[PDB]
Design goal:
Order of helices and strands: EEHEEEEEHEEEEEEHEE
Name: Alpha-ketoglutarate-dependent dioxygenase alkB homolog 2
Helix content: 10-25%
Shape: globular
Strand order of the largest sheet: 1-2-13-10-15-8-5
Strand content: 35-45%
Entry title: Structure determination of DNA methylation lesions N1-meA and N3-meC in duplex DNA using a cross-linked host-guest system
Keywords: protein-DNA complex, Dioxygenase, DNA damage, DNA repair, Iron, Metal-binding, Nucleus, OXIDOREDUCTASE-DNA complex
PDB class: oxidoreductase/dna
CATH architecture: Sandwich
CATH superfamily: Alpha-ketoglutarate-dependent dioxygenase AlkB-like
Number of helices: 3
Largest sheet: 7 strands, antiparallel
Number of domains: 1
Distance between the termini: 31 Å
CATH class: Mainly Beta
Assembly: trimeric
DNA sequence: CTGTCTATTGCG
DNA sequence: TCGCAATAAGACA
């Protein structure tokens, strides 16, 4: 519980390394063995009026009844499995927060990526934190303020950039997700896979 | 009626 | 290799 605090205007997150190399390797191995990713029609989204396969693999796990929707795609959560419960329980232990849902994004290499968005779901519990736990290759994670994007922005607030390491936890606390977009940009020189888990408190 | 704010490619 | 600008339109609300 030594945390790096990430502060900017309307930005309140914190970052720590939860697990040492050997433990994070074991957890990564088990994630690779056990996680089942969506394919085909459940891996296409619509943005700007055009449909695309997502440039990564995704999976959702959580309590019965929950659903998760973004960009024209609805995902239903698979029942919890031991490796995800273990990570969930550790994260809750260390933060005092609870979660009933996890979105998993796997980036096979640096060309897999995710575009800019806020985690402002309707189904998301108002004011609840999001716990982002990473395994595998380090990848750069980028926060941009809502008012600073476009050719002429309302304001020019500085972008915030963090490398997210193997075994790390990034807590995204209110009001981070009302004011800041985030993304995981392409990093061509990264050749190895990364699995990210974002634990959330969803409304049934 | 008003009026929307979102994955890839094409530059530089 | 990288980050930014440009990118439908109609079914909502």
């Amino acid at each position: 519980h030594s945390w790096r605090h990430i502060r900017a205007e309307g930005l309140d997150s914190s970052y720590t390394v939860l697990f040492g190399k050997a433990e994070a390797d074991e957890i990564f191995q088990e994630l690779e063995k056990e996680v089942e990713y969506f394919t085909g029609a459940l891996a296409r989204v619509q943005v700007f009026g055009k449909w695309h396969s997502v440039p990564r693999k995704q999976a959702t796990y959580g309590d019965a009844g929950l659903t998760y929707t973004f960009s024209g795609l609805t995902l239903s959560p698979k029942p919890w499995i031991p490796v995800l419960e273990r990570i969930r329980d550790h994260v809750s232990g260390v933060t005092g927060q609870t979660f009933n849902f996890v979105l998993i994004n796997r980036y096979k290499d640096g060309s897999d990526h995710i575009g800019e968005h806020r985690d402002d779901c309707r189904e998301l519990a108002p004011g609840s934190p999001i716990a982002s736990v990473s395994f595998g290759a380090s990848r750069d994670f980028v926060f941009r303020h809502k008012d600073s994007r476009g050719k002429s922005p309302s304001r020019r607030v500085a972008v915030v950039r963090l490398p997210l390491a193997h075994g790390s936890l990034l807590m995204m606390n209110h009001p981070t997700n009302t004011h800041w977009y985030h993304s995981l940009p392409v990093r061509k020189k990264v050749l190895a896979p990364r699995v990210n888990l974002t634990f959330r408190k969803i409304l049934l």
